[PDB]
Amino acid sequence: GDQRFGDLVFRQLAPNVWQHTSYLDMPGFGAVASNGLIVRDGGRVLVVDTAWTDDQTAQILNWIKQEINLPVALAVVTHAHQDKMGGMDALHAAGIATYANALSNQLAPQEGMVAAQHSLTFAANGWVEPATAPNFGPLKVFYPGPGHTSDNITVGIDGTDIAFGGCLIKDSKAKSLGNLGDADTEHYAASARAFGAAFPKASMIVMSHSAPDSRAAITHTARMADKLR
Numbered sequence: 001g002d003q004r005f006g007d008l009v010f011r012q013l014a015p016n017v018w019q020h021t022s023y024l025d026m027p028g029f030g031a032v033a034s035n036g037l038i039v040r041d042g043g044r045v046l047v048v049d050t051a052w053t054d055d056q057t058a059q060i061l062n063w064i065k066q067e068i069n070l071p072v073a074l075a076v077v078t079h080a081h082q083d084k085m086g087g088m089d090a091l092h093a094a095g096i097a098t099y100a101n102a103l104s105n106q107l108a109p110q111e112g113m114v115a116a117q118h119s120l121t122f123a124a125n126g127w128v129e130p131a132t133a134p135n136f137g138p139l140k141v142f143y144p145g146p147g148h149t150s151d152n153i154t155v156g157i158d159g160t161d162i163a164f165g166g167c168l169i170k171d172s173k174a175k176s177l178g179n180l181g182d183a184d185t186e187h188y189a190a191s192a193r194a195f196g197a198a199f200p201k202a203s204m205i206v207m208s209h210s211a212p213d214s215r216a217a218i219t220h221t222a223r224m225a226d227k228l229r
C-alpha cells in the first residue's frame with residue numbers, strides 16, 4: 001500500500017511506523033529514491049532522515065499533519081549526505097529538535113549540509129550514549145562501524161520487528177554497494193554484520209534505496225562487502 005502525496009511516497013510498515021520516500025534526479029543516475037521512517041510514539045511523532053530537499057521535507061511534515069496530526073518531537077539523521085540531511089533547514093523552520101552523530105555534524109558544512117542541533121556520541125561497543133539521545137522512545141540508535149560512510153548510524157524500533165540500515169544496507173538482490181565515494185571499504189563488511197547482530201530480532205530490514213527486505217539483505221550486503229578488501 002503505497003500512498004502518493006505530491007512527489008513523495010508513504011508506505012505503512014507497522015501500526016505506528018511508516019516509510020517516507022523522496023526522489024532526486026541525479027544527472028547520470030536517474031531519479032534516485034531515498035527512504036526514511038516516521039514513528040508514532042504515543043502522542044508524538046519521531047522522524048528518521050530528511051528527504052533530499054527542504055521542500056520535500058516540508059511535505060513530509062505536511063503528510064504527518066494530515067495523516068497523524070501530532071507534534072513531531074524530534075528527528076534523527078543517519079549520515080551527512082543529501083538523501084539523509086538535505087532537508088535539515090525545513091525541520092528547523094518547523095521547530096523540530098534534530099539529532100545526528102557528532103561526526104555527521106562535524107562533516108555537514110563541507111558536505112553542503114546544515115548540521116543537526118544536537119550531537120549523538122557512542123560507546124565503544126557502538127550503542128548510543130543515552131544521555132545524548134534523550135526522549136528517543138522506541139528508537140534504539142547504533143553505530144555499527146564505518147561502512148557506506150565513516151559516520152553512518154542505524155536505528156531499531158523497539159516493540160516492532162523493524163531495523164533501519166540507511167545507506168549501509170542494500171537489498172538481498174542488489175548488484176552493487178552503490179556510492180562508495182565516502183566509504184570505508186576495509187571495514188564495510190564487519191560494520192554490516194555488526195548492524196545485524198545489534199538488532200537480532202529485526203525481521204524487516206528497511207534501507208535507503210530499496211523496499212524493505214528480510215534479513216537476507218544483511219547477509220547479502222556483508223557478503224558483497226567481503227569482496228571489497
Ligand SMILES: O=c1cc(CP(=O)(O)O)c2cc3c(cc2o1)OCO3
Nearest residue numbers: 026029032081082083167178179181
Ligand atoms: O554522490 C553521490 C551521493 C549520493 C547520495 P548516497 O546514497 O551516497 O547517500 C548518491 C546516491 C545515489 C547515486 C549516486 C550518489 O552520488 O546513485 C544512486 O544513488
Ligand SMILES: [Zn+2]
Nearest residue numbers: 079081148167
Ligand atoms: Zn550516503
Ligand SMILES: [Zn+2]
Nearest residue numbers: 083167208209
Ligand atoms: Zn544512499
